[PDB]
Design a binder for these strands. Structure first.
Ligand SMILES: [Mg+2]
Ligand SMILES: [Mg+2]
Ligand SMILES: [Mg+2]
Ligand SMILES: [Mg+2]
Ligand SMILES: [Mg+2]
Ligand SMILES: [Mg+2]
Ligand SMILES: [Mg+2]
Ligand SMILES: [Mg+2]
Ligand SMILES: [Mg+2]
Ligand SMILES: [Mg+2]
Ligand SMILES: [Mg+2]
Ligand SMILES: [Mg+2]
Ligand SMILES: [Mg+2]
Ligand SMILES: [Mg+2]
Ligand SMILES: [Mg+2]
Ligand SMILES: [Mg+2]
Ligand SMILES: [Mg+2]
Ligand SMILES: [Mg+2]
Ligand SMILES: [Mg+2]
Ligand SMILES: [Mg+2]
Ligand SMILES: [Mg+2]
Ligand SMILES: [Mg+2]
Ligand SMILES: [Mg+2]
Ligand SMILES: [Mg+2]
Ligand SMILES: [Mg+2]
Ligand SMILES: [Mg+2]
Ligand SMILES: [Mg+2]
Ligand SMILES: [Mg+2]
Ligand SMILES: [Mg+2]
Ligand SMILES: [Mg+2]
Ligand SMILES: [Mg+2]
Ligand SMILES: [Mg+2]
Ligand SMILES: [Mg+2]
Ligand SMILES: [Mg+2]
Ligand SMILES: [Mg+2]
Ligand SMILES: [Mg+2]
Ligand SMILES: [Mg+2]
Ligand SMILES: [Mg+2]
Ligand SMILES: [Mg+2]
Ligand SMILES: [Mg+2]
Ligand SMILES: [Mg+2]
Ligand SMILES: [Mg+2]
Ligand SMILES: [Mg+2]
Ligand SMILES: [Mg+2]
Ligand SMILES: [Mg+2]
Ligand SMILES: [Mg+2]
Ligand SMILES: [Mg+2]
Ligand SMILES: [Mg+2]
Ligand SMILES: [Mg+2]
Ligand SMILES: [Mg+2]
Ligand SMILES: [Mg+2]
Ligand SMILES: [Mg+2]
Ligand SMILES: [Mg+2]
Ligand SMILES: [Mg+2]
Ligand SMILES: [Mg+2]
Ligand SMILES: [Mg+2]
Ligand SMILES: [Mg+2]
Ligand SMILES: [Mg+2]
Ligand SMILES: [Mg+2]
Ligand SMILES: [Mg+2]
Ligand SMILES: [Mg+2]
Ligand SMILES: [Mg+2]
Ligand SMILES: [Mg+2]
Ligand SMILES: [Mg+2]
Ligand SMILES: [Mg+2]
Ligand SMILES: [Mg+2]
Ligand SMILES: [Mg+2]
Ligand SMILES: [Mg+2]
Ligand SMILES: [Mg+2]
Ligand SMILES: [Mg+2]
Ligand SMILES: [Mg+2]
Ligand SMILES: [Mg+2]
Ligand SMILES: [Mg+2]
Ligand SMILES: [Mg+2]
Ligand SMILES: [Mg+2]
Ligand SMILES: [Mg+2]
Ligand SMILES: [Mg+2]
Ligand SMILES: [Mg+2]
Ligand SMILES: [Mg+2]
Ligand SMILES: [Mg+2]
Ligand SMILES: [Mg+2]
Ligand SMILES: [Mg+2]
Ligand SMILES: [Mg+2]
Lengths: 21, 122, 80, 199, 86
RNA sequence: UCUCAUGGAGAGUUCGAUCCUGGCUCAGGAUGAACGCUGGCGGCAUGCUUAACACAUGCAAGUCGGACGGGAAGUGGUGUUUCCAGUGGCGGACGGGUGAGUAACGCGUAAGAACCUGCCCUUGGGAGGGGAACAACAGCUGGAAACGGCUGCUAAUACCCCGUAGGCUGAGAAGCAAAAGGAGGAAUCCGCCCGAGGAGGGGCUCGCGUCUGAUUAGCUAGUUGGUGAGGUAAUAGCUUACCAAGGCGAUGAUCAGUAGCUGGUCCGAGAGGAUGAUCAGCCACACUGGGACUGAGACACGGCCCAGACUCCUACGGGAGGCAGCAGUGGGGAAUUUUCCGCAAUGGGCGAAAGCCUGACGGAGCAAUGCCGCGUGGAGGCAGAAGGCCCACGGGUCGUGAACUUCUUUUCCCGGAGAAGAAGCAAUGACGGUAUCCGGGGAAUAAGCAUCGGCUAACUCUGUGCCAGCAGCCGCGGUAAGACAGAGGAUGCAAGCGUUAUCCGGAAUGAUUGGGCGUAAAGCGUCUGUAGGUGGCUUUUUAAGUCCGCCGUCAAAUCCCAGGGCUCAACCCUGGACAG
């Protein structure tokens, strides 16, 4: 498996976690 | 006249009215002939003039003059019309560009050929 | 930040640059604060007005490589 | 973009045009039909004046027009400045230096890269000549031969005081800017300026 | 810049006044001068000013959805005080 | 007769004639133009104005292994070195496109005070002692796929706690708050936390300027202000409760209609009119509406959520998507280009650097769309011949024109060499073996298009007979048409020439400069009078207009002047300035 969307995805997840903090 | 009166906006221009409303700010428009027929000119010019009615893309219906000598146009033909007025015929404000789309060029015209849409003879 | 760089003027194939103090986020030819140097490869024409250069290097303007080395040749980094 | 048509013909209708033809016109032989247009409308007088100018220098209209704009701009007497500008053309200077038979000749001479202005080849007719300028032939056999034969076999020594010619290498030199009295034709620039009020 | 002098049309409200300022302008086309009159909500703490007053008008931060201007004592004006007659 | 001026043209048409008022029409410029005919080259530009209508395919934002745990390629193995999803770090808020909405502090200008600020400078101090998790991975498992679910497991520049703090709250007393390591053998480097500055980038507030409509006259109740509590990075009806009754409006509020705005562009003798493509600044928008989250910065074009409309995939249970990014397809249309090359230059992003990515950009291709340059030959050529056309048959004219003789080779053809653009270590060029330069042939490869009645430069003849047709306006055409069609001839422009559309001019025809109202269009039927405008003389005051000097600014580009560079010009570059 190989995933390419760094900008979108990674930033979206980060947004969740930081949001909960 | 009185300064105080001009300062109330007493000078207003008359705007420029177009001679060819049907074109709507275009060099030409394309249309389909609804009818092709002859009309008699206002006296004292007697003749039989070749006019078609054209329904345009801009939705209008107009009456366009057809120039030159003789023509092949018949109903449900697709032509190209341009502006300019035939002082003879009441209401006729548009010509039909010859040599384009469905109007062929005038046959056997040797002089001022570009006005009628004719090739140069070899 | 403020950057001292080249903006590209002149014509197709014949290129001539101005050296300008401008915020880094404006476009390459966009608006600027001050015009400073003049540069050109083909005429080998180069020169700068140093008072401005120094007044901007002082307030923390960062140059771009090409420009950096232009100021080097003209000895503006020594005075600094 | 050049007038390749019959020359004598334009000459019959305009007047005397040096930069065109050295052959004096035929007796004119119009004395049979005795056809005239009556006289000339003031407009036609003006028009023929401009045409005089235009064909003497082998300039196109759209060009002449831009000369005239340059003229109205310039600070000075308009007709005079115009005549200056037209008379400073490289081919025309090449002509009035006797380095050419006529202006189409001189023009051809320039086109084919046979001429030098200050040690550099200029092949375009309309190059404007400025004071202190060197007009040379290219050093090749052909260039020299052309210039020599057309210079020597034409006797005219009328050189108009702003133009120097020097003998063996054939260095021509442009000395200064033309004087209104030294101009290359009989023309009232007044008429031409007037014709051009509408552009 | 230069502050705007005017006269008070309304004192009724609290800590405020409504000033009218009259200025002359050279109308863009016709070159004659014209009186244009504009009204302002001026902030006046202490409510010292009454109706009819001639007051100078000053600029400060927003006090409200309207009042940006501080009401200020008449700046310089020709004394309506009688003067000698030599 | 010094100084200034470099600028203002008319013509036809009402009448049997005239003079006038008055319209229509023409001659000139300009296009993001289109169409017709014709088309050799180069230089610099330009290229969906209509449907902000739909979009098949491919590409347009990533980078860091020197934050970190892993596994996968090899190698003989952790000596070498690579890739890789994942957590973290900054960047995806710039750059690119469009002009739908917006008559507004949105834009231009000029002010202000209550703010914010990652990166970049400048500076003052610091970085103790612990602990807990979560992906990855592992195992089990659900799905056609898309994507999931359980249980374990683990590192950190990722989370949490405690100590200390020139800061924050507070009249005070007091109370409260921080950290992160990675490189290197060490020196040292890049970082980290807290203050305090700088510059730049944003947020707000206000004066002024910022379309048409009165056959749109009243509009507004958180509306206009006051207090108390909240809220915002900050001031504020920003919010909310109470109190008060204001605010705006005939100098046009509200409502309706149109429109992105400005440097500018086009036109004008000027005064000013019309417009807002390319180029540059600002605003607004991202399938149609609404939310927030993250973050220095977004209410976020190639992010999230929801609703809706539409397209696709599906093994039917469910998923996927947003070209008004570069190309490209359909469609609308009179009309607007290649599913191109390259990161070499400049500019960006990340990185210690090496470097990687950039449909920004740099270039090519297509198109006479426009502006500028050049060519299609130069010189001589019995005054004799063929032929067209006219002719009172004498001759005229196409016409020195061609044929013909010589010279020249820009352009064309065939060979050679061949750049600058690349920046100080060399190397590194998409353009391109292009621009340019040397040789060899050879007049050799290259002229059309309008008009010829007046305005308007240019005239005759044959064919037609109120017909066929022309025309911008007057008007031409019923047997000899200078107005139709053909011929010959001439005239104008020229690789373009015409026709149509659009705008300004001429138009003094909406008139400030610059008109009129006894009879031509035009004085309310007459007064009284409110707002509004103008208003006698003399002295003084003030200094708002007014005037003069000095300063700040009105971005660069454009226009104007003076030089310089592409062989010239267009175009580019430097310097400077009147206006206002
Ligand atoms: Mg007009
Ligand atoms: Mg160099
Ligand atoms: Mg040309
Ligand atoms: Mg001809
Ligand atoms: Mg050349
Ligand atoms: Mg004019
Ligand atoms: Mg009458
Ligand atoms: Mg009559
Ligand atoms: Mg009149
Ligand atoms: Mg015209
Ligand atoms: Mg063609
Ligand atoms: Mg569009
Ligand atoms: Mg696709
Ligand atoms: Mg790619
Ligand atoms: Mg590595
Ligand atoms: Mg790497
Ligand atoms: Mg690091
Ligand atoms: Mg190792
Ligand atoms: Mg990786
Ligand atoms: Mg953006
Ligand atoms: Mg942008
Ligand atoms: Mg663009
Ligand atoms: Mg403002
Ligand atoms: Mg604003
Ligand atoms: Mg306003
Ligand atoms: Mg940050
Ligand atoms: Mg610690
Ligand atoms: Mg603590
Ligand atoms: Mg190491
Ligand atoms: Mg170490
Ligand atoms: Mg406007
Ligand atoms: Mg309330
Ligand atoms: Mg709109
Ligand atoms: Mg005028
Ligand atoms: Mg566009
Ligand atoms: Mg733009
Ligand atoms: Mg769409
Ligand atoms: Mg936040
Ligand atoms: Mg937005
Ligand atoms: Mg984005
Ligand atoms: Mg997109
Ligand atoms: Mg596209
Ligand atoms: Mg199509
Ligand atoms: Mg179509
Ligand atoms: Mg590519
Ligand atoms: Mg690059
Ligand atoms: Mg770079
Ligand atoms: Mg960097
Ligand atoms: Mg490009
Ligand atoms: Mg071509
Ligand atoms: Mg071209
Ligand atoms: Mg071409
Ligand atoms: Mg064309
Ligand atoms: Mg086109
Ligand atoms: Mg000849
Ligand atoms: Mg040769
Ligand atoms: Mg090098
Ligand atoms: Mg050669
Ligand atoms: Mg005539
Ligand atoms: Mg005709
Ligand atoms: Mg016309
Ligand atoms: Mg008759
Ligand atoms: Mg007969
Ligand atoms: Mg006849
Ligand atoms: Mg006869
Ligand atoms: Mg005829
Ligand atoms: Mg003919
Ligand atoms: Mg006018
Ligand atoms: Mg008047
Ligand atoms: Mg009148
Ligand atoms: Mg009457
Ligand atoms: Mg009357
Ligand atoms: Mg009366
Ligand atoms: Mg009455
Ligand atoms: Mg009265
Ligand atoms: Mg009164
Ligand atoms: Mg008074
Ligand atoms: Mg008085
Ligand atoms: Mg400027
Ligand atoms: Mg100059
Ligand atoms: Mg030059
Ligand atoms: Mg300049
Ligand atoms: Mg000024």
């Amino acid at each position: 498996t190989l995933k390419k969307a760094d900008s979108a995805a990674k930033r979206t997840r980060q947004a969740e976690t930081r949001r909960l903090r | 006249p009185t300064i105080k009166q001009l300062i109330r906006n007493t000078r207003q221009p008359i705007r420029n009215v177009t001679k060819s409303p049907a074109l709507r700010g275009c060099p030409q428009r394309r249309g389909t002939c609804t009818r092709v027929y002859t009309i008699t000119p206002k006296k004292p010019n007697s003749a039989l003039r070749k006019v078609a009615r054209v329904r345009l893309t801009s939705g209008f219906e107009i009456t366009a003059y057809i120039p030159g000598i003789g023509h092949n146009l018949q109903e449900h033909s697709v032509v190209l019309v341009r502006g300019g007025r035939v002082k003879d015929l009441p209401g006729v404000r548009y010509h039909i560009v010859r040599g384009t789309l469905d109007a062929v060029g005038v046959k056997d015209r040797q002089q001022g050929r570009s006005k009628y849409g004719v090739k140069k003879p070899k | 930040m403020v950057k001292l760089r080249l903006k590209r003027c002149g014509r197709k194939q014949r290129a001539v640059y101005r050296i300008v103090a401008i915020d880094v986020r404006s476009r390459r030819e966009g608006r600027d604060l001050q015009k400073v140097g003049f540069y050109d490869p083909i005429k080998s024409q180069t020169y700068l007005n140093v008072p401005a250069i120094l007044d901007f290097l002082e307030k923390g303007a960062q140059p771009t490589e090409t420009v950096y080395d232009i100021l080097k040749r003209a000895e503006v980094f020594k005075e600094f | 973009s050049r007038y390749r048509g019959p020359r004598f013909k334009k000459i019959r209708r305009l007047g005397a045009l040096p930069g065109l033809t050295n052959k004096r016109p035929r007796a004119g032989s119009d004395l049979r039909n005795q056809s005239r247009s009556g006289k000339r409308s003031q407009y036609r007088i003006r028009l023929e004046e401009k045409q005089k100018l235009r064909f003497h220098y082998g300039i196109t209209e759209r060009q002449l027009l831009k000369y005239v704009r340059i003229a109205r701009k310039a600070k000075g007497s308009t007709g005079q400045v115009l005549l200056q500008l037209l008379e400073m053309r490289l081919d025309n200077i090449l002509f009035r230096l006797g380095m050419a038979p006529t202006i189409p000749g001189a023009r051809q001479l320039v086109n084919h890269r046979h001429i030098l202005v200050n040690g550099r080849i200029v092949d375009i007719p309309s190059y404007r000549c400025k004071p202190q300028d060197t007009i040379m032939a290219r050093d090749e056999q052909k260039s020299i031969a052309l210039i020599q034969n057309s210079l020597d076999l034409s006797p005219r020594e009328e050189l108009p005081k702003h133009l120097t010619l020097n003998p063996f290498p054939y260095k021509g030199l442009v000395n200064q800017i033309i004087d209104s009295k030294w101009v290359g034709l009989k023309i009232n620039e007044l008429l031409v300026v007037e014709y051009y009020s509408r552009q | 810049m230069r502050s705007m002098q005017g006269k008070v049309i309304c004192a009724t409200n609290d800590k405020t006044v409504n000033v009218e300022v009259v200025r002359l302008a050279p109308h863009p086309k016709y070159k004659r001068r014209v009186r244009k009159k504009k009204k302002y909500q001026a902030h006046d703490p202490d409510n010292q000013f009454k109706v009819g007053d001639w007051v100078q008008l000053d600029k400060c931060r927003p006090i409200s959805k309207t009042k940006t201007f501080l009401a200020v004592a008449p700046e310089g004006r020709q004394s309506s005080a009688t003067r000698p007659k030599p």
